[PDB]
Amino acid sequence: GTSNRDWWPNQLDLSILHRHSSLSDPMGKDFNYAQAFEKLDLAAVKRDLHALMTTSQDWWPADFGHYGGLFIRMAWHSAGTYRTADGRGGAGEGQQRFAPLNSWPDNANLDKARRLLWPIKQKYGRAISWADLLILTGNVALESMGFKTFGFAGGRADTWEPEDVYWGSEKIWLELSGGPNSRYSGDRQLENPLAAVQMGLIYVNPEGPDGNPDPVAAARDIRDTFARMAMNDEETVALIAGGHTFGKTHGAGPASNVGAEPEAAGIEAQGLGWKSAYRTGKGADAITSGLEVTWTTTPTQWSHNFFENLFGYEWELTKSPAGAHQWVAKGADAVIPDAFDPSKKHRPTMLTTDLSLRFDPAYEKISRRFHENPEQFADAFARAWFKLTHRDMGPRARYLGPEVPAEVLLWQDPIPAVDHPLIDAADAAELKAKVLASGLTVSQLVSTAWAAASTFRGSDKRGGANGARIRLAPQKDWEANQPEQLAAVLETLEAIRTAFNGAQRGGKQVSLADLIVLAGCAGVEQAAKNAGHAVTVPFAPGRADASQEQTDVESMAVLEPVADGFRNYLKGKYRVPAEVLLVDKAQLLTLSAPEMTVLLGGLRVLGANVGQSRHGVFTAREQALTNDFFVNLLDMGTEWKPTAADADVFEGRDRATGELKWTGTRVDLVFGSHSQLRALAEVYGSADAQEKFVRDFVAVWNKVMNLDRFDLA
Template structure:
């Protein structure tokens, strides 16, 4: 097992590197270790609700200094309409390793959700990119139209204003970075710093200037639908069934909120750790309809503490999707490898990168 696979968030979890072992023994050891870890985390959940990150986020003073110190630069580099001038080669002026570190510093905050902005950063990157239509060549992260109305107000994007506001001081600190690069890099940082795989990423997105560039509503998945709808949405982006199954594994992170999607609860007991627990929970737990006044969803029968969406259940009932789910549940290494490829592809949909734009593979911070 590589060091990256042993790193899990919250930071209170141990970061140990396992030594190489024969394939069969290593697989068995991983399966046993994950089962024990999940059981321990579930016990912790019932006592403390979802686990919190060990470190507090940046202090209000630190954030204030960051924002205030950036205002002068923001004014200097702003255009007449108040938005920074970002040209096709602006990325050349940015040290993206520093941007990575600054985004990582914004992740942990004991006062937000389960103690981390990581899950909502992943969702922001995902929704900024997942509007791409391979047929019309429209949508995607280039232009970052998710920050404009009406796209920002689409039902699927409810709550993402929180993520955009959290990142805004960095846009002011690095006025030459495009919003598209900032939002997608935030997703990469979150996946890696929460224990996930290394994601290849490159800069060069531009900023759309007008709301007329927004994509129409309905291009993102509807959680209430089944396998046919899921395929329609992802095939439109250019993904196949295996890539779709890999991407849905990101539901190991975060939780649903009644004030945003209407649904409620986390998918598992470690919503700030990037693992293959979405698949293991989906297959190994017993899911029953939740009895409540909200939209139809499932909860685990033993405790009722965890949930699955109707669209999630399609990955258990559809025979093709289930084949991939079973593989990822049994082998987290395989999931990480396939997710890294699919997520990098998602973030680049529709983007015309400069020919010399570098490809980054950032190392997760210790």
């Protein structure tokens, strides 16, 4: 059946904003996962998981009689898709069970792992999500094998359809770099927002870069990809050596024996894939990666044997039975146990990427320290494993259950606790009037609150106005935030705050985070008054102010908006058209296409553009909240043409006279071009729409101000 995507493959795609509707959700509109999970008997689930670890099923027999290694890999792959660039990927939505991730080649045979967990999932039902179960199972694996984890939080609600994620442009699984859709350019520069070296890999190629088995070069790809998943050298080494303390790889025969991935398999395979014609197709005969390496002498027990082997031997390049490059210990005895035959033993073996931990000079220093001090290793790994598996969960307020670690970690972007009474409705009214009496304009107030709140992204639940990090490095210096203007607004609000807090009794006080948001509320109300409309904008206090010492400046860098169509901002020139970036930003803000539309048209006329650009400001009453953006955009009395200076800037001229009326960017004009977005703009551009426009604008403003308010819980 030919589709619109076939006819117009470059048309903007809005369907990403309409995933996750109530249509596709099987749970009731009132289902609250946190409430279900809080009553789960977590100790009973962990006991069932523990029993499972050594209860082998014949359709996928357990290596060494223990599924621990398999489950650790499952949990590390669930978490391992995460990219800091956009926050997308990660374990927080259980996306490993849907396409494409369920059929990525790096996820081969994790379909067996997830099916082993069905009887438990079935037993506990809605009280434990698949998302939480995948991580929990990895923790119980570790614990059952003598490793003390750092803790665990529940709260990852299940999802019901695939996320629309850009995973690269290659059309062939695992394609080596340098092809027509290469994700590399220049001196091995991986394109943002990607965080893996080949399509369908978690991070790197275990043979080495594009299969070249050089540990030194592989180390470069390790460091680059892991940094793109928010891990530094210490954490990287800890995680890789930690993981590879357990279990084994599977490459017992040629890969051509392995059939279709789960999405391509026949209906009779009932959601499983990679069926293998090699011998029994499983157990002793399994083929997963094609590598056949077993790292330690006790693959089902925590040890420091990974580094004892890594440094205790010299390594020789060899081939697995499937033909893949891997390494074997020179002159060693057969000390490694076999997974099924107690009379067989094997020499120590390593991946190219394991050897990176010894041959890259910076990793070698860490690895030696871990080898000499295995208690340091165990602590690094436990911390790193926690971070890995929690990094997309958002603020600690979302963390559920009895095993949440009490230690507050910098990477969590922590918010201090509130320990005083909050402002009430009458206080909020008083503060809004004081803000408006100070002389701050609608434009300033809107732009500042927008800047503070719109760093949120629903992909990993980072950002938002909570914390007042807009006043700290690096947010205060981001170009989009207009640093000099920002500093003047913040100085005025901080003097308001000081005066209000100094007059209170009873310890009542207002945070600057709350006041920034409340002041934006005042600006929106004032804008509405300017247009002849009395409205109240909702406001919920309870935000707190974080310090500079609680703010990791390097980690915050990825939240810098380099494109924010809502402020008609583009930091530089990108390959992707600006309207595509607008829709991407709307997705991260959790906005539907109607919400995106109303919000953008309102912000234009409120003076939210960076630099006070007139692009898209289609009103003669700037700082009044009206539908003028839509009414003027849609006026067929105006003709639009790209300018000679810049193809991405358009002039709107009266069609009859030639007189210049407006200028706009692609982000403005897409609302009059795209057929779905224009249908939206027409509703808000209609003569009966002033009331609806105002109401819907206020609702979406408030939604944005509250995106990170997980304390309202």
